[PDB]
């Protein structure tokens, strides 16, 4: 093994939210701050009632001023299940290069940061120990996927993904709930790993 | 293994001539027909003295009228060495999709036809048991490589390949004699297989 | 005829199933194995009730364990009718380059392998004499057609083709039943041959 | 022949000057007018000593004021030889669509106007029965060839053609004297027709 | 006027049928042959009830065998009205390069062949003095317009034009009756000429 | 004249420096400050001895701190000669859309700002009445010309222009001294105006 | 600040009408001239009942002959509010390059001409002191935005903007009333400035 | 600061080696292992005597078997100087998005991993506690830069960069020694920081 030509490998992109974990940062924030307008805005954003970015920025503005420590504290509710680790490792076995993405913060989703071969999520701005706003590191997941316009993509996602993300993938798989653009539907992380281990 | 997603695999393209076999069809024809103008034209074509296609068509016109049986007879001088088979099988192990190409005829290079996952060479036209001309199935090897413009390509070739073929590859490897565009140089099929087994 | 410039020729792409043969591998398998869920999944898949790939992989999973010999035997129900041969030979007369495609297996559809100038279908995986799964050699037929994006395409297909395959062709012809995107509709292979002989 | 799908055919483009005719309009004007600066400028333009357009516009300005009729008489020196007609008709038989182009005037090259399937050359401006200037209908022959960028191109040309025109062709043939970009070299129109008749 | 840089000029494309003439070739043939299926098919093709090409080829097959002379006689019902000539000449005045196109035959629309700076229509096949079929010189008018993909286009058309032709134009003008894609609606050729004479 | 369709017009691009004015801002500043390193750097930048941007920024740093008033006073040495105005107005007459560009400052080249239909140059930074640096509004003139990638371009330039600017133009004209890429050479503004007045 | 690399900055494009000013030139002309058909046509054009260009040219034709001075007085109703100036200056502070665009006339919108870094609107034709017609300087706002296809775009617009303009933007913001394609909706210029100030 | 639109920011790409650190991993390894063939291969590779990848893989093969711990220990000679930190933080001030790249290992260059906004380098393969080979995560730095083809790029690099990396950047800055393609040359990191603080 004088070489692993990683750059020539096909890419497995996993949207972390709702595929590797049930944790939903904005619902947790809605609980913590008692502001149900946050979770209402989430619901509106997922249901396509309002434009995604609008809901996101409104929510971001809502939790503004929150303590840094309280914020990072939510990391403890995020966990790399052994099923998730199995999925990633299996994908590597089955010849893929694993890329994990999320709309949420890297600071919250830190356990996954070194799990896959590449990791991208948005970030948080902290002035004087208090939350100020969000660093939007990518426009959306579809646009982000343009980084691999030069290769092939197997995409796995849940209710935080959408058609645009899958219209970039060569093979698209939705988890739990159906998504326009996805080729297959599995019911849960289990079914998904069972599928992935049925490869090559 | 409910699925081998072959279409998402990176592609290993091998130019058969001078990498998997020492057989040179046109030199054999030059010997058989005693026309040294054929081999002279070959030499001129490789050395870039004359434009490749011109030399090729002149040679094609030179062996015109040759017997069908005599023609196909040269197949017996073509052999799938165990080193070659090892190379292909190893490439498949090391995650590639193997594509074999040649400027010569499929009818002569028939043993390799089912070796790799894809096979392309030019063909022969036979009217009344006599050789009439050539079916040019592709313009050149670089242009042919546009079939995989959507993925990555490791290219291995010898003196019948050129810069244009390698300018398409992400990683290019020349065998025996140096080629502009190639990233590496191995000395022989042995060294090449040794390299390939040092992968992933 | 010192040269046939096959690569400059316009391309006639034929979806084998339902144009060159009445044979439907999955229905046949439904008969052999008595698993009617196979033919039900096929029916659902064609009607777009379920996503094509999902139903397909389900069907593959249903026939898992079938004997290799029994599987390859299904080839015996596949035959190159003289009408098909006439169609292909006519297309060659009318200046086309014939490319045969199918979503089904090369192992079953082998008689057609040498009929056209190029042949592509998916393949079968056989571990320990028993059938394990499917090698998907192309993403779909439309995507496959990108191999000839540098020229023109006349596409002929039946119910295993769809809009995506035809939105690539410059001229599209549907066989038997109408397909969104197709320019013309013929009723069967005969009428299609009558059409093709009417060219130039 | 209920249909000729002409638009799907590969394109044979012939640069008229030095391939179908010995006629060189500018040398003729140089003789007619006794201005040898015209033929000198032509020589300079062909040899690439000075920019083509500079020489062309200089020559146009040189013959300015010339009589319309006197101008058009040069047509009488133009003849569609039976060899040329044979070339075109053979190309048609060998499946091509014929496009004739020239840098010179349509008014002079009128006999060729209906020979091929498409015809393009520059034109002449005539106000009050006298030659005023030139209507430049295409930038150059390479740029012109972009009209068929959606298909394949066999290009045949002589010393009024150049690299840019042939860098567009899939197959390039030079007539009489070799040109960078051309794939083949023939010695004359006869040899070229002999070549074309060795096709399919 | 040492130069008219025609190739740099913006292009004014006129769909001849129903803009420069009230003549409708297919209705005329329908009258001549008393076959109302021809005119019914015309109506169906325009209304998009059946695919355009299907209806067209049906009509071509319907009129098959008609006498050559009878066919060409229809030219006599086509006339370059002075209003049309005014339109074209004005367009040249207003800085345009005029290109005339139609789906009908050049043999019929001959008066228009030298009217504009470029002319394209489909053509007719005549074997042994009898009409055999049609040479389709372009796929459609929209596709045809790609010959000018490198510049700007003002497109004018009537009920034989459609949306695809106009989605290529930078400015689209409908005549008589509204068409999806067009920017403007004029009532007749007069109104259009008045519009064009109001330019620059 | 209900409309001037300016956006459909072909574009005439004039590099102001050395075409519309003999004024050279950097030489003037070099005289003013007695720093000959400025003019030496100008010479070096034009001759390609050192990279253009390097020399430019060196000059900018050289002149740093200069008084705002002293800087803008140089406007008084710039004049819209009546020949220049004639050129532009003629270009509009001859169907062009005139765009003026320069590497120098808008603040200096102000008379030209409303001359053509579009105007672009770089600008100056002034903090507390003293010159601080340069706002580079375009990367280079060639890159700038991409704003008109959708149409045609006649480009005219002098010794402050270069090849990259002209490889974008469909027709390029050099003034005074020859530049790689240009099609023509004129000797002065007069000759150029005479050329332009010889159009259409 | 020896350098401002302005060309590398992301672009903030503001559609002036309904974002920076309440001024609606066509309503103003409708009032001035008592032709209510003007404001009716405006309403129809905005609501997409009739094609934008049709309505625009109809309106232009409606106010034809109007006095130049009377026309320009409408400028006096135009004011660069301090909120607007604040918006632009903030955008500059938040790292953007500001481009102001409008469908209306530069002559009316002169106060805004030097506000942003780049300014584009359509223009007016005035022969003999009287309004004749309109110079259309861009096809539409979407097409205009192609000038910055090489970078990123934040677009802010109101009811004179549309989907095409926002489908070009990476981030779209509608002002006052929601527009398909826009990502966010603010209620007024104030809210928008408050948003912009929450950046970086 | 409710939002930082990082994705719309222009990108500053820094090749770490020879810009942010004097550390040269292969030379260090040459010291530790006393194998001077390593440093000889490096020298040959930089000078382009041998193809980069060939020399690289040779070097990898030389250091095969080295202890994992000893390898990772080399990190101790890598340190984020305060000048580097100043550069990155300044780039962020000056509106850039900082992307750190290297051909070397993440394991050695770990201190820089969290310095910029994005970090990419190649990795190490460790089987049974001993070093086996290299994971090539990108083809080369130029190819890597295609991740930001949708925006602008300021590239800073040293002797581990080359022309291909700079022919992608809109503005290129070389450090220490001149590189073909670079626009500017600085002598060391200090002068570069002095340059960067001079922006906007």
Number of β-strand runs of chain A: 8
Q: In what order do the strands lie side by side in the largest sheet of chain A?
A: 5-4-3-2-6-7-8
Q: Class by helix and strand content of chain A?
A: alpha/beta
CATH architecture of the largest domain in chain A: 3-Layer(aba) Sandwich
N-C termini distance of chain A: 21 Å
Note the overall shape of chain A: globular
State the domain count of chain A: 2
| Main sheet overview of chain A | 7 strands, mixed
Global Rg of chain A: 17 Å
EC number (chains A, B, C, D, E, F, G, H): 3.1.3.3
Enzyme class (chains A, B, C, D, E, F, G, H): hydrolase
Pathway (chains A, B, C, D, E, F, G, H): Amino-acid biosynthesis; L-serine biosynthesis; L-serine from 3-phospho-D-glycerate: step 3/3
GO molecular function, one term (chains A, B, C, D, E, F, G, H): L-phosphoserine phosphatase activity
Give structural notes.
Eight copies of one chain form a homooctamer. The first copy, chain A, folds into two domains: 1-20 and 81-199, 3-Layer(aba) Sandwich (Rossmann fold), CATH 3.40.50.1000; 21-80, Orthogonal Bundle (DNA polymerase, domain 1). Chain A has eight helices and eight strands; from the N terminus they run ββαααααβββαβαββα. Chain A has helices at 25-33, 36-46, 52-62, 68-73, 82-93, 141-144, 163-166, 189-196, and strands at 3-4, 11-15, 97-105, 118-127, 130-136, 153-157, 171-175, 184-186. In chain A, strands 5-4-3-2-6-7-8 form a seven-stranded mixed β-sheet. The longest helix of chain A is centred in the middle third of the chain and has 12 residues, at 82-93. Chains in contact: A-B, A-C, A-G, A-H, B-C, B-D, B-H, C-D, C-E, D-E, D-F, E-F, E-G, F-G, F-H, G-H. β5 of chain F pairs parallel with β1 (3-4) of chain G.
